[PDB]
Amino acid sequence: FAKLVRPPVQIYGIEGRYATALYSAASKQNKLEQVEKELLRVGQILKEPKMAASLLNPYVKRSVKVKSLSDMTAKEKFSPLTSNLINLLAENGRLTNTPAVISAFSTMMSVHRGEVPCTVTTASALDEATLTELKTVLKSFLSKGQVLKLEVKIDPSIMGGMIVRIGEKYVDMSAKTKIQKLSRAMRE
Amino acid sequence: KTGTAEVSSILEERILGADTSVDLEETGRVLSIGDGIARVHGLRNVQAEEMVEFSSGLKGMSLNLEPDNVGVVVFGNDKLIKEGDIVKRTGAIVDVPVGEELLGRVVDALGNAIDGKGPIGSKARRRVGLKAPGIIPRISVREPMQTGIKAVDSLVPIGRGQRELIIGDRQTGKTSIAIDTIINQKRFNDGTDEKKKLYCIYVAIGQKRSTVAQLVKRLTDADAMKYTIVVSATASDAAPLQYLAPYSGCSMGEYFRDNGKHALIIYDDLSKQAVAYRQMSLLLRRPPGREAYPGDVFYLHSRLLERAAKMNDAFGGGSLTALPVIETQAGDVSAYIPTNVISITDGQIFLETELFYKGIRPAINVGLSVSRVGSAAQTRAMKQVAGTMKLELAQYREVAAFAQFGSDLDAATQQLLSRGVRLTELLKQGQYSPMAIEEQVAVIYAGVRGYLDKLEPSKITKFENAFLSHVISQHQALLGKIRTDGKISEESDAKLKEIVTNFLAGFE
Amino acid sequence: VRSSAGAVRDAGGAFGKREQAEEERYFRARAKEQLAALKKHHENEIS
Amino acid sequence: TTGRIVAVIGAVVDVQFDEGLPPILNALEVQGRETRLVLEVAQHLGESTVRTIAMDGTEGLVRGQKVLDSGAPIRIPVGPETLGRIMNVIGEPIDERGPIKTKQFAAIHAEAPEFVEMSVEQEILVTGIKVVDLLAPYAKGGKIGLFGGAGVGKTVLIMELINNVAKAHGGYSVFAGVGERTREGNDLYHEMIESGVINLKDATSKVALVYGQMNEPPGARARVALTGLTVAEYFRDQEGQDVLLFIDNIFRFTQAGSEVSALLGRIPSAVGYQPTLATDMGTMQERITTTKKGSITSVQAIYVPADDLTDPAPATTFAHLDATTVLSRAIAELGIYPAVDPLDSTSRIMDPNIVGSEHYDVARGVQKILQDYKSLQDIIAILGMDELSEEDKLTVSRARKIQRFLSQPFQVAEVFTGHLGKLVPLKETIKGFQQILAGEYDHLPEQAFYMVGPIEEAVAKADKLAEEH
């Protein structure tokens, strides 16, 4: 078989297999950015209430669905890769999980351009200077060229401190966990 | 949901328009391979049960045609097949060579010689999956198929075009019944009568190679290979070969049937063909039924056994007797495959281990044995003596419980016990020593007229022998008269009376 | 479903043990008698 | 080639390859293990993944661990240097004595001999055991089975055979312990060292051992039989000589195959067995054969789960054996040892034209008298012995004498019985049983015949019983 080039992050499931096929197809011929843009476009194109209502009805024949999607793709001047992907999803009847495929490819492309999602949780909000030093130190965690994608949620359930997720790495300087630790060890 | 062809390799091919340089009509690429089952992508123009050929020189049969893929069963080890291989159509359903060029040759399930005696003649070929005859071509079973065994020929007659069934336990004598039947046909094949010659086929499913080699040596010793084919599908063979071997044998025999000759096919053992089919079906993810057997396992054996027919003179008159062998486990004739094949066939020779060790070898248990053809498959002389023998044995089987007590019972029961014991000691037979029909009828006639009520039971096995040698040497005219004539004429009856009395007059 | 010889002692119920004992007692008695006769013959054949 | 673990479920590891896949049955080596873990490929799942069974514990495996592809099936060291050693499935030594230094490595997977290689000659193998020699005589080059449940004498009988046949056997010998207690493996190692078949000093060892005991994961138990079989095959072909091959039990091969089938995606068959039971057993039992180039005498112990001889595993194994000796618990309860069932044992050579008419007639007379005894036992359960025809009591007495006379003391069962082992030549067994049937001993008591060798020993034991009466 053709030795497909594996994606950076392995997505699994039906969407995973379709997205890995698309990523392998695009990586050769080097059309990853354009194909991602076209995927974002079809993200809205199919979402149109008329098109969505006409594609979620399993009593319109697959022939009609494929013909309509071919017409839309021609009317949008897409890459042959994206047009063939939409045709393939339509033939296999996998349109109901098309947004899953776009989301999978988005996740797969983000890692391709070197991004490590991050999460910070605190009892209350932060002052922008402190967030700046957080940016600096977290970038210290990352490797060379690995952009960061910070997300700062606010969880009052914890009693203070901070919680940081960087990929699968996790550091919990939160008051609640330390209270729990002392209460347990002291209880013993 | 999910399909097996939705793997990312196929989708990758199809996204960048690389699916147009590949011929998906007569070739396919293996998606999966495991436990002897390959799942192939493509082969869109492949017929059910067609034979495909893998790139590595192996063959396979395409059984499951699903929307996404084709389920091929490999004819050998799946060591040589790897995911991504190339599978090409052969174009033709599986067929085997046929003709008199197979006689005396050991072949495997596909007609390839395995005895190292050179290529196989093979002028004609025949498809293994051919529909059996219909209602009209056949005619009632009338001719006898001389087994050469006193019990089988006397109380469980087998005609030509009949499907008997040698059902029994392990190590009871089933293969011995089959081999004695095969060996007894030399007296007809050697002769010149062209409507009595029987050609034999021995299908050996799932037996180890040493057993088949010893069996072939046994047949060669008895000079009974020149008219025998042996089709080996031994244990090391892949499941599809064990599954096909009965059908290859049946087609090699249907050749003889279609051309006016007569054939005998001995599917030994069918309960192993059922197991091989069960394997193939379970690995193809087909829905299991009772005991994990697929639903169409009755179909598998019925479409095989219903090819044993007796064509009429407007088609040639040939015939194909079938003697399927089945091994019941404890005594369970109510299990699945024993039940199916008991309901398919026309009778049964039921063998025992209680009788085997009580000294009654062959261990044919009459009363449980039956032949729904019956007297129609017997000669007139054999009918005459066997009617009385069967009646007396039936009388003896319902008072055999008293056999231990015996004494302190009325005279009628004593006589029944005595006659029954003499008759049972008469039905005892050696091994690989079949007997012509005249010999059998002479012996049973001596037995059933009371001429052994004086001899002690321990001496009946010696009487039988000495008397038989006597008649075979001194009196050939009477035996020839009975044989050719087919019946016991009044003068022949008187001659038998005088011979039996004169020999018994002094025996000591 | 049938029945076969030597099944009473295959079940091993009450009849099986009863039969085993009915056999063992009798043959112990006969063994004792035969041993007595063997001793008598031994003594009578010394000379 | 280099691949990468992508799943670990029990003993089944799924390995993904970016380059070309490895063929089925190939051995792969996991990189990053202190010991040697070898996986064996069993399926191609598509998408470049291959499923495999691990020949060792899969603890501490990490999704992503690199894997090397050896390119060939598991290759074990073979030759005269393996004699006196012990081995794993993968051939590395487990006797703590150093590397096995051979020049030949043999792959454990091979095709069975073709039909044009089968030997068709049979001659009795006299083992020195009365019941075996009389009713189910063995044969040189033939495959022997020892069926029976747990606790009936399979291991004791096989040890006894090694004591007799192997000790006085010129050719080599192989013992593959498949899924059996490790205590027994050590006991055999030390007993062999004591006897002298395994010599730790010189190079005169006559036995090669392979052990896959029941602490191993199913992958290793399913393949140690093939490892022992490969050693035996090499000694058969290249050495061109007689070989013995003892296996204990060959039911653990089937069972170990059944413990992974469900995880490989196969629907089960009749009773929680893999769908490929008969094929998997045939592709192994078909390499244990006496071709025209050599000769393997194979003795196999076959566990029968819950004494059920109709279970699929023993039921299927029955068809691959020339001789069988069905040890029975109902006879071991009576104290008759070995508990070989005289009516449920058979041999191929048991014909008048191979053994002789005297041997055959004696055997058939014994079997007939025992069957008649079984028939009578039903009546004795109602009447009683006192009410039998004076001829029947004769049958019962002969049957009990014959039942006891088949018992024999082994040289390896000294510890249990405390008696001394006896080897009975074939002519003496035939004479003993012919005399017992002919009535030349219908005065000696039954117990005189219990656990003795030739018949004269029974006479002497009866004399002693009478003197201290």
Describe the structure.
The structure is cut from a larger assembly and holds chains A (188 residues), B (508 residues), C (47 residues) and D (469 residues). Chain A is α/β, with parallel strands linked by helices and 188 residues long. Chain A has eight helices and five strands. Chain A folds into two domains: 1-112, no CATH class; 115-188, no CATH class. Chain B folds into three domains: 23-92, Elongation Factor Tu (Ef-tu), domain 3; 93-378, Rossmann fold (3-Layer(aba) Sandwich); 379-508, Up-down Bundle (Lysin), CATH 1.20.150.20. In chain B, the strands form four sheets. In chain B, strands 1-2-5-4-3-6 form a six-stranded antiparallel beta barrel. Chain B has a five-stranded parallel β-sheet with strand order 8-12-11-13-14, sandwiched between helices. In chain B, strands 15-10-16-17 form a four-stranded mixed β-sheet, sandwiched between helices. In chain B, helix 6 (239-258) crosses helix 7, helix 8 (298-305) runs parallel beside helix 9 (336-344) and helix 12 (411-427) packs across helix 14 (457-474). The longest helix of chain B has 20 residues, at 239-258. Chain D is of the alpha/beta class and 469 residues long. Chain D has three domains: 1-73, Beta Barrel (Thrombin, subunit H), CATH 2.40.10; 74-349, P-loop containing nucleotide triphosphate hydrolases (Rossmann fold, 3-Layer(aba) Sandwich); 350-467, Bovine Mitochondrial F1-atpase, Atp Synthase Beta Chain, Chain D, domain 3 (Bovine Mitochondrial F1-ATPase, ATP Synthase Beta Chain, Chain D, domain3, Orthogonal Bundle), CATH 1.10.1140.10. Chain D is built from 13 helices and 16 strands. The longest helix of chain D has 24 residues, at 357-380. The interface between A and B is medium-sized, with 19 and 17 residues. Chain B: The modification N6-succinyllysine is found at residues 117, 123, 186, 195, 217, 261, 383, 454, 462, 487, 495. Chain B: Mg(2+) binds at residues 175, 268.
